[PDB]
Design a protein around this ligand. Structure first.
Ligand SMILES: N#Cc1cccc([C@@H](N)CC(=O)NS(=O)(=O)OC[C@H]2O[C@@H](n3cnc4c(N)ncnc43)[C@H](O)[C@@H]2O)c1
Ligand SMILES: N#Cc1cccc([C@@H](N)CC(=O)NS(=O)(=O)OC[C@H]2O[C@@H](n3cnc4c(N)ncnc43)[C@H](O)[C@@H]2O)c1
Lengths: 484, 484
């Protein structure tokens, strides 16, 4: 009686589990005793959860909150939801109870599912509740009864909604199109093991899952508890034989500061990928110098398209380089830089706002058509067609070869805090530095800065801190540094 | 310097010319001396026209009017436009000068191209003019100079705009998705020869071209001058060895009336496909009876998605059958029937308005965002997602097996003119009949009707005519029958 996605129709289930056929006994997951779960064993768990979910009578586009971090079970669940056309709303179990309630209030989901040993208690009787474990999907409270109206699942049905409360609605067509564009850029082979560090609620986690599983590679989820301590993190990457390490730039900060020599011992690491924010070039040069056999890729994009461009950093990074390139749009993606009148910028080195044409475009903001119409706008170079572009909120300029350079959020003398942080990171004893004019440093600095920086770039205040504070998703917490 | 579509990005060029690689010497076209043009020779002409077009400096999404009927040269041109991301506006050379001017006024194209021996004179100096022939593309007036801004072609770039002045904007992604859905329904093999009868300006022509060329089959364009006379039309189908015959129901009307015995001699015809309007069941039963080895397929859909469903008619058609089924949506398509409150109709045999979820959805109506927002509407079963559906303007009901039945335009006792026309087509001496209560017949009838029809279905007037008048696209011209 449940609709199931057909194999020919774009859908995360068929896309991520194709390797269960061509390579059933190859590893889909490596976890830590180092264990592997094969593609066949993963499809078996997905099919079991999907048989259980199908009993609940949910209609296509009924929303399932998945509270978990990246685990074989949580990935088995989101793929079960995918086959049944039930958009998942991934929520980290670290999300505060209040923030979760606010998501439940707006998203009005039919079902909330967490791990057997999950800790969430606060869930209204309108929302069904279930727990999943290699034991199976276990319904605690059934979702409330309904009449199914959707006969067939399509490409534009929602795969997932990302909540930060702003909800980015992504279709199977959009996310599969992104995975296919990256498969074309041979970032990954089937023999790779991708260490993934992002919270499940961050699309960087969904990007890592699909890149691994869509390629026939193994995923190595790094638990936050392993990530937070430098020797522990390095022993986890060594033990699991990780070949690729994905994370926001901050994942390296403790290892660079405390354990650079053990970091150099990661001889199986072939590739590093970051996204989310600028990697401070002094830390990035330090990292590159320790792992000279690891390709480093600058990943640019936003939740609204999942991603835009993948750009290998120069080897070595020029000492004098001020900004890494964010390169060229993925195959099938296109950028217009438009000025403050909405006109194309053709001039080398002049910033405009990125307007992205992407096959991975979000459907809209959940229950916010006004916000949707401000962001997903009529193509300003062809406004009579009804074609839309993403008005990204990001500034960029091109260089002489047409490559892009990120130039900050349009809404956040032009100060480049990156140049302030660079000069400070070049001062004896400073391991980290964030500017917002206040500079915060992890450990005279003022005169060292003034020896090369213009007057408007010299910090008014330089504040010693034990660490750079991070958001749940691992980005610099500038709100937090503001408070103190 | 011209952007060209990449092979990995949905685009009519790569989709229709893949057979130039796997089967270069197989026929792409059969024309009438019976000649063939191979896939390789077709790609050569496409590449030549595209090299010439690229010289003109047009930007991606610059519009090219193609005035032609279905010919190897006109198909070579629309595929050249496709590779360069130049949406084509196909216009039949039968279109009156006034109607063309009205299209030029709204669409403001950069270029108008016609055949060497084309007859159009009326084209403003703002629009470039060119003529194409196996000689090459020949520029008469260059388009006016411009700066190119688009770096890369994407999936959602416009393939073509259909004008009837209402302009349906179709993307490469939408039209390729439709061709792929039909390739999955093995309508056609590479050994087939598809006789196509629609004017190039009608998307039925574009449907036929892509089905043939995307499959590696041969296209057999039927010129209007061959189509208009019954023995001439049958000799053309015989000489070219057509294996499939596509056209609106009216293409059969003269052959059924004048040459039924020669029609039975079409021994190579394996398949017939119609769309656009109801096939009057008495003519359809007559046709099916003459070619018992031809599968007949009822094709339902609209320009806004190119198509929706393909449904093989029963063999034989039950004598008592009142309506052919329009079956089930193509793989990856989904229909909701919604009532006059906007609520799902689940009841067998109750009509509602078709809301279509389609991967082949139009981008919008050219320079008409108001009309777009009335037709491409928020999914009424999931309106907070920003997902849209086509509000089709078509009524339908389901039968016991969930199959659809077309029940007329929402805007056009409920009279079923089909039942009035049926009873008249069953009266001795009537070969055709159209009701609009007035009935028009091609050659006491009133009492024959009253012997089985309810009072409200009995024509007030029965008018003998020499023929049923047709639109350019070959549909019944009810406006025309109204005048007289
Ligand atoms: N390649 C790649 C790739 C792979 C996985 C997931 C993603 C993104 N969804 C990650 C992300 O932070 N998205 S965001 O919407 O929260 O915030 C997006 C914003 O974060 C900033 N950003 C994102 N990438 C950045 C980069 N490489 N350098 C500098 N800033 C970058 C930009 O402002 C951007 O609009 C990209
Ligand atoms: N399968 C298939 C297939 C292949 C090629 C091209 C097409 C359509 N684009 C043809 C067409 O007439 N489109 S229309 O937009 O002008 O007018 C559409 C309208 O014409 C009517 N229509 C279209 N198909 C019909 C059918 N099979 N039976 C009855 N009516 C039908 C409906 O009202 C529909 O909304 C369909």
């Amino acid at each position: 009686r449940a609709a199931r996605a057909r194999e020919s129709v774009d859908n995360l289930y068929w896309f991520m589990l194709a390797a269960a056929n061509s390579a059933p006994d190859t590893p889909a997951f490596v976890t830590r005793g180092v264990r592997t779960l094969s593609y066949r064993e993963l499809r078996t768990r997905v099919d079991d959860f999907a048989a259980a979910l199908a009993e609940l009578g949910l209609d296509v586009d009924d929303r399932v909150v998945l509270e978990a971090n990246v685990t074989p079970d949580a990935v088995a669940m989101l793929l079960a939801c995918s086959l049944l056309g039930l958009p998942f709303i991934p929520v980290s179990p670290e999300t505060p109870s209040g923030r979760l309630r606010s998501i439940l209030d707006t998203a009005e989901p039919a079902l909330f599912a967490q791990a057997e040993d999950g800790g969430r208690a606060d869930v209204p009787a309108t929302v069904g509740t279930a727990r999943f474990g290699a034991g199976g999907l276990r319904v605690e409270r059934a979702p409330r009864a309904r009449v199914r109206h959707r006969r067939e699942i399509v490409g534009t049905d929602t795969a997932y909604i990302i909540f930060t409360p702003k909800g980015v609605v992504m279709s199977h067509r959009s996310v599969v199109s992104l995975y296919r564009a990256i498969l074309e850029q041979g970032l990954i082979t089937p023999e790779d093991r991708i260490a993934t560090t992002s919270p499940l609620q961050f699309d960087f986690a969904l990007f890592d899952i699909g890149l691994a599983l869509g390629t026939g590679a193994a995923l190595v989820p790094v638990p936050r508890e392993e990530l937070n301590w430098p020797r522990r993190f390095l022993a986890f990457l060594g033990d699991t034989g990780a070949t690729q390490v994905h994370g926001v730039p901050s994942i390296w900060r403790p290892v660079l500061r405390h354990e650079p020599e053990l970091l150099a011992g990661l001889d199986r690491v072939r590739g590093i990928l970051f996204t989310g924010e600028d990697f401070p070039l002094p830390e990035l040069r330090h990292l590159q110098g320790l792992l000279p056999h690891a390709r480093i890729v600058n990943g640019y994009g936003a939740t609204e398209s999942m991603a835009c461009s993948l750009t290998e950093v120069p080897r070595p990074i020029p000492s004098d380089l001020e900004r890494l390139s964010i390169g060229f749009p993925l195959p099938g993606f296109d950028v217009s830089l438009l000025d403050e009148h909405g006109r194309p910028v053709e001039e080398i080195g002049v910033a405009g706002q990125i307007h992205l044409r992407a096959p991975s475009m979000f459907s809209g903001y959940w229950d916010d058509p006004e916000a949707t119409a401000r962001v997903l706008v009529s193509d300003p170079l062809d406004p009579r067609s009804g074609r839309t572009v993403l008005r990204s909120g990001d500034l960029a300029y091109r260089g002489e070869d047409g490559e892009l350079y990120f130039a900050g959020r349009v809404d956040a003398n032009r100060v480049e805090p990156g140049e302030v942080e660079r000069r400070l990171l070049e001062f004896p004893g400073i391991s980290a530095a964030v500017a917002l004019n206040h500079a915060f440093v992890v450990v005279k600095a003022r005169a060292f800065c003034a020896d090369t920086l213009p007057g408007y770039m010299i910090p008014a205040n330089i504040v010693a801190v034990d660490d750079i504070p991070l958001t749940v998703n691992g980005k610099v917490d500038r709100a937090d540094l503001a408070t103190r």
